[PDB]
Structure formats: structure tokens, C-alpha cells
Design an enzyme around this catalytic site. Sequence first.
Site, short mmCIF file in Angstrom:
data_model
loop_
_atom_site.label_atom_id
_atom_site.label_comp_id
_atom_site.label_asym_id
_atom_site.label_seq_id
_atom_site.Cartn_x
_atom_site.Cartn_y
_atom_site.Cartn_z
N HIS A 93 120.31 -11.53 42.40
CA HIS A 93 119.58 -10.47 41.72
C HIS A 93 120.05 -10.48 40.28
O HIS A 93 121.24 -10.68 40.03
CB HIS A 93 119.85 -9.10 42.36
CG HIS A 93 119.58 -9.08 43.84
ND1 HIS A 93 118.40 -8.61 44.38
CD2 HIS A 93 120.32 -9.48 44.90
CE1 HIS A 93 118.44 -8.73 45.70
NE2 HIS A 93 119.58 -9.28 46.04
N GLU A 103 123.34 -5.28 41.76
CA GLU A 103 122.94 -4.23 42.70
C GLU A 103 124.11 -3.27 42.91
O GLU A 103 124.02 -2.07 42.59
CB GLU A 103 122.43 -4.88 43.99
CG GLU A 103 121.19 -5.74 43.73
CD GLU A 103 120.29 -5.82 44.94
OE1 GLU A 103 120.77 -6.24 46.01
OE2 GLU A 103 119.11 -5.46 44.79
N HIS A 116 124.33 -13.07 46.56
CA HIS A 116 124.42 -12.65 47.95
C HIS A 116 124.38 -13.88 48.85
O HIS A 116 123.35 -14.56 48.92
CB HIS A 116 123.27 -11.72 48.31
CG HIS A 116 123.38 -10.40 47.64
ND1 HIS A 116 122.32 -9.52 47.51
CD2 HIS A 116 124.47 -9.80 47.11
CE1 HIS A 116 122.78 -8.45 46.87
NE2 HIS A 116 124.07 -8.59 46.63
N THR A 196 116.57 -5.18 50.14
CA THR A 196 115.13 -5.29 49.98
C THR A 196 114.49 -4.89 51.31
O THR A 196 115.12 -5.03 52.38
CB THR A 196 114.68 -6.72 49.62
OG1 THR A 196 115.26 -7.68 50.51
CG2 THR A 196 115.09 -7.07 48.23
N1 LIG Z 1 119.62 -8.62 49.35
S1 LIG Z 1 120.31 -8.75 50.76
O1 LIG Z 1 120.73 -7.44 51.23
O2 LIG Z 1 121.29 -9.79 50.74
C1 LIG Z 1 119.07 -9.28 51.91
C2 LIG Z 1 119.29 -10.37 52.76
C3 LIG Z 1 118.30 -10.75 53.64
C4 LIG Z 1 117.09 -10.06 53.71
C5 LIG Z 1 116.03 -10.48 54.67
O3 LIG Z 1 116.20 -11.43 55.42
O4 LIG Z 1 114.94 -9.76 54.66
C6 LIG Z 1 116.90 -8.96 52.89
C7 LIG Z 1 117.88 -8.57 51.98
ZN LIG Z 2 120.34 -9.73 47.89
#
Ligand SMILES: NS(=O)(=O)c1ccc(C(=O)O)cc1
Ligand SMILES: [Zn+2]
Length: 257
Positions: A93, A103, A116, A196
Site C-alpha cells: 500500500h 496503513e 504485507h 480491504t
Molecule cells: N491488506 S491485507 O490485510 O494484507 C489483505 C490480504 C488478503 C486479502 C484477500 O485475500 O482478500 C485482503 C487483504
Molecule cells: Zn495489504
Amino acid sequence: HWGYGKHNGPEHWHKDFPIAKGERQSPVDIDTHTAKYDPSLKPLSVSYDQATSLRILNNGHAFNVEFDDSQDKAVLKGGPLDGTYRLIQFHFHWGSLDGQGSEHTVDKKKYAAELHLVHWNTKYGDFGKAVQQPDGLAVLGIFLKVGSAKPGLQKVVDVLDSIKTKGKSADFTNFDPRGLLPESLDYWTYPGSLTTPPLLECVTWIVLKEPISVSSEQVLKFRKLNFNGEGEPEELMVDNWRPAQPLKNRQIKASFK
Ligand SMILES: NS(=O)(=O)c1ccc(C(=O)O)cc1
Ligand SMILES: [Zn+2]
Ligand SMILES: NS(=O)(=O)c1ccc(C(=O)O)cc1
Ligand SMILES: OC[C@H]1O[C@@H](O)[C@H](O)[C@@H](O)[C@@H]1O
């Protein structure tokens, strides 16, 4: 569809994903003075030596580097975790300028970006089952600040021109995610969520204290990506971060004294 703009950004997500207002949402601000050292945390083990990257995808919200997770290869164990968590993908991000993009925040400080590394608990067999469980996922979060270049990031940077728009992918084999780590594995941890949609409350967050440095040129190339598909009006992929959410009935624990 959900996104980051004025009409579809984080403040709208709750309409279609009511868990957005839930009790363990992410990200959060990490108040470093209130976070407490936890002697019950076991040593953290980031074991990425046999990682098998496969592909890089622009999904319209970020880019994901995807891994073969059909066997225990790149895994995360220890720390707050019970059992073995397999690496499935990483993404970032980032902001429109260096002063925002992360974030998580640290004493309200925003970093330029946040990596991430997403892992799922092998006791649940597959990622889809894991996101039905309170302890289904572990995300290793790493802050990016702008300074010297990160050599291990450059292969990622250089492929982005080939996945500019939503729905484009490219081969991305033989990428070693160990080149994205900082020196220290000191971390903070807390229970949270995907950041997300669908915002599922399945994640043990492990956020490293030491940022990695990346160059201005590296992050500038992130900001040349597009949210839109080919042939559609250009919308630069920037500011794809969710702001900090209420901590609610949680404590952040530190791995370090
Ligand atoms: N930004 S995160 O919280 O690492 C993340 C990781 C995976 C997914 C998904 O598979 O939908 C959504 C958010
Ligand atoms: Zn993420
Ligand atoms: N709740 S949400 O998935 O962020 C969302 C926001 C806006 C729109 C739209 O304008 O069409 C659709 C979904
Ligand atoms: O009751 C005392 C306990 O309170 C909890 O909120 C803290 O997490 C523990 O570290 C502490 O020992």
C-alpha cells in the site's frame, strides 16, 4: 465497486461490508508507549529459503506477487503464532507523496508505504477455509521509508511497466522475498482483519518495528501503475491505503523489552 476514491473509498465500505465497523478491524495506530513487552511470545521464524514465486498481478487495487503454497516452502512460525503459516502472496500500500501511504501508523506517523506478506494457517487446508477462522491468517507488515534504494525490490519495480493496468499479469518466478526484510525482526502484534473488502477478522498482525528504506525512484514507479483497465481513463494507483481504525478491546504486544 469498492476502491479508494471519494465515492467508493474506505468511508463507504461498510455499506456492502458491515464488518468494516467491527470489533477487530485493521489497520490501527500503534501507540509505542502503551504497547507492552510480552515474554510469552516465542521466537519468530521467517523461513523463506525455499520460496517459489510464480506471478505478479495488477488486481485493480494493488499488485500481488503470488507464491506456490501447495507445500510448506516459505513459511512463518513462532512469535504469537500457533503452528505453521504458508506464504501465499505479498503486496504493498502506498501514497501519492512520501508523507503518507502506510496503513498502520506508529505514534500517528505515516510511512511512505507498507508491505504485507500474507500467510494462511495450514491447519485449515486452504486459504478459503482459513478466512473462516479467527486464527486463519498471519500478515507480516513492513514499513517503507524513502532514502537509499532497496536492491531486493528492484526486480519488482522493473516489472511494473508490464502490468500497468488492472487485470494484467506477468511471470514472476525466482523472486526471493528475503530481500525485502529489514535487519531486525523486532515486532508488534495484535489481532485484526483484512484491510480491504471483505475485511474479514481472521488476521494475526505482526508489524516489524524497523522500516526498510527504498529510493524515491522505486516508490515513484509504484505510483505509475493504474487502478483502471487498459483503454479506460487513467487513474493512477496511489493512496491505496485504509486509515487506522478503532482499537476497541485490544492490546498491542511488543516482542522486545
Ligand atoms: N491488506 S491485507 O490485510 O494484507 C489483505 C490480504 C488478503 C486479502 C484477500 O485475500 O482478500 C485482503 C487483504
Ligand atoms: Zn495489504
Ligand atoms: N461499499 S463499496 O463496496 O465501497 C461501494 C461504494 C460505491 C459504489 C458505487 O458507487 O457504485 C459501490 C460499492
Ligand atoms: O491482569 C493483568 C494483565 O492485564 C492484561 O490486560 C495484560 O495484557 C497482562 O499483561 C497483565 O498481566
